[PDB]
Design a protein around this ligand. Sequence first.
Ligand SMILES: O=c1ccn([C@@H]2O[C@H](COP(=O)(O)OP(=O)(O)O[C@H]3O[C@H](CO)[C@@H](O)[C@H](O)[C@H]3O)[C@@H](O)[C@H]2O)c(=O)[nH]1
Ligand SMILES: O=c1ccn([C@@H]2O[C@H](COP(=O)(O)OP(=O)(O)O[C@H]3O[C@H](CO)[C@@H](O)[C@H](O)[C@H]3O)[C@@H](O)[C@H]2O)c(=O)[nH]1
Ligand SMILES: O=P(O)(O)OC[C@H](O)CO
Ligand SMILES: O=P(O)(O)OC[C@H](O)CO
Ligand SMILES: [Mn+2]
Ligand SMILES: [Mn+2]
Lengths: 277, 277
Amino acid sequence: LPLDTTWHRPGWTIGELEAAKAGRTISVVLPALNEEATIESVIDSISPLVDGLVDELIVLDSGSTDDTEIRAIASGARVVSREQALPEVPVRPGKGEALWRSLAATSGDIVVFIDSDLINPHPLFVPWLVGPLLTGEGIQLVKSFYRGRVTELVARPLLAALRPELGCVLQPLSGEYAASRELLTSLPFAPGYGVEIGLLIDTFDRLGLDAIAQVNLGVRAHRNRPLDELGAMSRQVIATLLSRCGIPDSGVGLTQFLTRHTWPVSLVDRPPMKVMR
Amino acid sequence: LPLDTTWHRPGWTIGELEAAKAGRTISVVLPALNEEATIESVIDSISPLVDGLVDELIVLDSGSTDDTEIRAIASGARVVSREQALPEVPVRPGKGEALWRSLAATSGDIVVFIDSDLINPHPLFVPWLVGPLLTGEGIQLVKSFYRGRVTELVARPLLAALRPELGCVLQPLSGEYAASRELLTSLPFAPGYGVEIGLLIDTFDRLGLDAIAQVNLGVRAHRNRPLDELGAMSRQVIATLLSRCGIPDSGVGLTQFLTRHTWPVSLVDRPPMKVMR
Ligand SMILES: O=c1ccn([C@@H]2O[C@H](COP(=O)(O)OP(=O)(O)O[C@H]3O[C@H](CO)[C@@H](O)[C@H](O)[C@H]3O)[C@@H](O)[C@H]2O)c(=O)[nH]1
Ligand SMILES: O=c1ccn([C@@H]2O[C@H](COP(=O)(O)OP(=O)(O)O[C@H]3O[C@H](CO)[C@@H](O)[C@H](O)[C@H]3O)[C@@H](O)[C@H]2O)c(=O)[nH]1
Ligand SMILES: O=P(O)(O)OC[C@H](O)CO
Ligand SMILES: O=P(O)(O)OC[C@H](O)CO
Ligand SMILES: [Mn+2]
Ligand SMILES: [Mn+2]
């Protein structure tokens, strides 16, 4: 593949990777909205790395109203609200907002994102993801893949239509990935569920494929959302993808008939966090 | 809805509808590719209308290699191959080809399409669909709806993005619909699975919503295809939708990793069947 792809279990040990840091730091961010059932398992999969390979782990709590925050705290995680991450700026809804704000609440040269709704995640996710950033050259972004309705019906076919160079990316919508701060604070952040696809297209347009790697995380399980919520997610993915391709989006939310309901869509990106410096 | 929508069971009787024909004829087309398990049930749901409300029923056999044709014949249906429908023109693959060719093998002023993979279809499908064409004014196209992964994730959200006026169409991808010959032979036909969405957008752009109605057919069951085949279907739907919206499509087929496989996509429409006159 024209895309650096690690097809089998990476061979790097935790101690090698740590040596390879060479003064660089690593932050881990778990965005979370109402994931009380899974958040503790995810934090626990990663907290053993802290003060070693990982210099920092935070939960970016994105407005949870369940026990996400208390359970995360009881697992020893630093929990940061959207408001605390960036208090001069009023909070908008959606995942992209949470991730963008997380840049202001972390200081790692490398930032790793892991969804907090994962079912029994491997403790090597973070080592496997930072590998190419640490030991490669010019890699600034690493995507995960795994053995994807929105992914297989919406994002990959749309990429084939409009950015076929990215056809080799197996899981463009993957919530597990790592990237340099220099890259992330230089890119705008799409709102809502548009954030991954925006980052991928923006990264590629700006640095080309050679700046991107992907690593196999094996098998993945997570919360299965209802079709209607996916419809809304897909709508936002489309809105962001069309925008990156110079195509005007109507700005009209998807409507569904159960009576009538209109879901929000946003055509507004957050600017590169750099301007907030 | 700005779209003429019949929300409950239509009240027209078969005898009223027949009276309303007023010299107009009605053709029914069942496109079929390897539907031996369901084809007989579908034909039988409709053949009682023949020589009455329905003047003509054909199965457009689209290259079947199972018992579709023999079973359809044994149910008393006229079976027409792609080659027989239009023998001067070599056959291309896909559904859109079959439907376009079916225009050459029928002569009804009204043409009704019904998928041949339906599980126990109602015998009133055809009466319910021709209703607005017979008793309305200016209606040239009638779509069905029902209580849709490609539909809900790809087509409706893309329509919301690019032709939001069509947001009120509940089942844009529905295989059950009827339209005037005058309309159908005036429109190009998208290849493969692009044919429905192309017809809807072309119809709207040319006649506006007032020329379109939709009728509730209740509940629908059909063959559930694997995700990868849907991926390919979605790719073609996207290709056709982008084209109708003036957006250049790469022409690159969707690739999937199981090793690598590329599915065909086509950017070539068939012209209005009128030019073949
Ligand atoms: O407003 C939100 C919505 C989600 N999340 C968190 O983000 C993660 C992913 O959200 P989820 O609802 O599980 O998304 P998915 O349906 O799995 O969507 C997939 O595809 C999306 C589009 O790229 C990605 O954003 C997701 O990370 C990816 O898992 C979860 O941990 C959530 O807790 C927030 O923090 N705030
Ligand atoms: O090359 C082909 C492919 C399909 N068919 C027939 O067309 C009908 C619909 O095909 P199907 O594979 O069942 O499509 P769906 O997955 O159900 O796709 C839905 O969405 C598509 C995109 O609009 C429509 O074309 C379909 O009619 C609609 O049911 C079936 O009776 C097939 O026998 C052909 O005749 N030739
Ligand atoms: O929830 P699924 O089964 O529709 O697939 C979700 C993938 O992990 C992300 O698109
Ligand atoms: O086969 P489904 O369940 O994915 O839905 C199919 C609809 O009838 C057409 O998009
Ligand atoms: Mn999830
Ligand atoms: Mn079907």
